[PDB]
Amino acid sequence: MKVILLEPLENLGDVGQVVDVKPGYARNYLLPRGLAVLATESNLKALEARIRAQAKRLAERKAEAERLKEILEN
RNA sequence: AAGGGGACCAGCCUAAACCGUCCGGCUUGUCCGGGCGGGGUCGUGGGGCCCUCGGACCGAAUCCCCAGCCUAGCCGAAG
Ligand SMILES: [Mg+2]
Ligand SMILES: [Mg+2]
Ligand SMILES: [Mg+2]
Ligand SMILES: [Mg+2]
Ligand SMILES: [Mg+2]
Ligand SMILES: [Mg+2]
Ligand SMILES: [Mg+2]
Ligand SMILES: [Mg+2]
Ligand SMILES: [Mg+2]
Ligand SMILES: [Mg+2]
Ligand SMILES: [Mg+2]
């Protein structure tokens, strides 16, 4: 069963990552303890949009600076 | 059971894509979800979206009126 981790988890996987666990594990431990969520299409979308939105504001800072290399350094 | 002969005869509405709107969530949006509206409905496959061209008739199973019908009656020949 595919779930998306909400946290780093000892020898399972890393936050945001999509892993495969026994339905029991997911339903009766992972999900109830907030540690993960079903890899539904609908919240697979969302994880993708977060990966997307983080990657925007990061490469957008690696540009706000690189541009400030141009004001100084000259 | 098909098929043949008959009775009757009638076909429609959606879900999804996509577009819009309100509402809610927290893991802030190019987000996810729920309501509503638009769109769409099919087997020669149909639809959506994007180009090109083209730009009145049909019509209810709903509603309204009416004929007709029912719920009392009445006239009715000649010892
Ligand atoms: Mg048979
Ligand atoms: Mg027959
Ligand atoms: Mg027949
Ligand atoms: Mg008959
Ligand atoms: Mg939705
Ligand atoms: Mg929406
Ligand atoms: Mg909606
Ligand atoms: Mg087609
Ligand atoms: Mg109808
Ligand atoms: Mg009499
Ligand atoms: Mg008499």
Side-chain angles (χ1 to χ4, degrees), chain A residues 1-55 57-66 68-69 72-74:
Chain A
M1 195 187 210
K2 293 192 187 305
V3 270
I4 295 166
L5 275 9
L6 292 195
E7 294 202 11
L9 263 103
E10 85 231 350
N11 320 98
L12 222 183
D14 192 355
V15 42
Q17 172 185 355
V18 161
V19 289
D20 215 6
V21 300
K22 285 168 179 296
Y25 197 18
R27 280 196 281 260
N28 288 315
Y29 183 78
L30 299 186
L31 276 68
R33 288 170 192 256
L35 319 185
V37 166
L38 280 347
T40 55
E41 233 176 358
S42 92
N43 47 63
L44 226 51
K45 284 179 197 177
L47 149 92
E48 197 162 283
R50 307 305 294 169
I51 292 181
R52 161 129 1 94
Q54 199 183 317
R57 77 165 174 75
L58 157 53
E60 155 67 13
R61 299 316 182 264
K62 198 176 307 289
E64 205 222 308
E66 288 282 9
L68 189 59
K69 241 182 85 189
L72 326 179
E73 292 231 354
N74 275 21

